[PDB]
UniProtKB/Swiss-Prot annotation:
Protein source organism: Homo sapiens
Oligomer status and interactors: Interacts with p53/TP53; the interaction is direct. Interacts (via CTD region) with CDK9 and CCNT1, acting as an associated component of P-TEFb complex. Interacts with RELA (when acetylated at 'Lys-310'). Interacts (via NET domain) with NSD3, CHD4, BICRA and ATAD5. The interaction with BICRA bridges BRD4 to the GBAF complex. Interacts (via NET domain) with JMJD6 (via JmjC and N-terminal domains); the interaction is stronger in presence of ssRNA and recruits JMJD6 on distal enhancers. Interacts with NSD3. Interacts with NIPBL. (Microbial infection) Interacts with bovine papillomavirus type 1 regulatory protein E2. This interactions may serve for the tethering of viral genomes to host mitotic chromosomes allowing successful partitioning of the viral genome during cell division.
Post-translational modification note: Phosphorylation by CK2 disrupt the intramolecular binding between the bromo domain 2 and the NPS region and promotes binding between the NPS and the BID regions, leading to activate the protein and promote binding to acetylated histones. In absence of phosphorylation, BRD4 does not localize to p53/TP53 target gene promoters, phosphorylation promoting recruitment to p53/TP53 target promoters.
Associated disorder: Cornelia de Lange syndrome 6: A form of Cornelia de Lange syndrome, a clinically heterogeneous developmental disorder associated with malformations affecting multiple systems. It is characterized by facial dysmorphisms, abnormal hands and feet, growth delay, cognitive retardation, hirsutism, gastroesophageal dysfunction and cardiac, ophthalmologic and genitourinary anomalies. CDLS6 inheritance is autosomal dominant.
Domain comment as written in the entry: The NET domain mediates interaction with a number of chromatin proteins involved in transcription regulation (NSD3, JMJD6, CHD4, GLTSCR1 and ATAD5).
Positions of crosslink type Glycyl lysine isopeptide (Lys-Gly) (interchain with G-Cter in SUMO2): K60
Protein name (record): Bromodomain-containing protein 4
Full protein stretch here: 44 to 168 of 1362
Designated gene of the protein: BRD4
Site keyed Acetylated histone binding: positions: N101
Superkingdom, taxonomy of origin: Eukaryota
Phenotype when changing N101A: Abolishes binding to acetylated histones
Amino acid sequence: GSHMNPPPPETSNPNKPKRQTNQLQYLLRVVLKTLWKHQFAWPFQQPVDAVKLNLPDYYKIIKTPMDMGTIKKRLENNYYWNAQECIQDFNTMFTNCYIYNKPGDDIVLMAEALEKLFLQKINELPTEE
Ligand SMILES: CC(=O)N[C@@H](C(=O)NCC#CBr)C(C)C
């Protein structure tokens, strides 16, 4: 894409140790699955294309971008060591939306609906075995 968008977050790095855990399997098969298919998922399914959206200040404000397309690839490609790393990515994605946009805004209402579902699912994250 455009030279004016940053490179997306890392989804592959052989030097980073990786593990499958039951919690990570739940984050893919239950959490990501549930949120990905939601009516309001679409703005979150790929990195923000600030050029196409005409938001030249986006990556001036948001220095820790994250999106569910990146999280999906991280889960599918077993990038994580533990569930906390993945939960942090989700939280970063929501917080970026809340920081950049105004409380009224459609995108915020959408993020808040996804976050409510996320919280319900994470309260049932299974005990690590
Ligand atoms: C969710 C987030 O981080 N911010 C959104 C944003 O840049 N503004 C939405 C509007 C306008 Br004009 C992005 C996901 C599209």
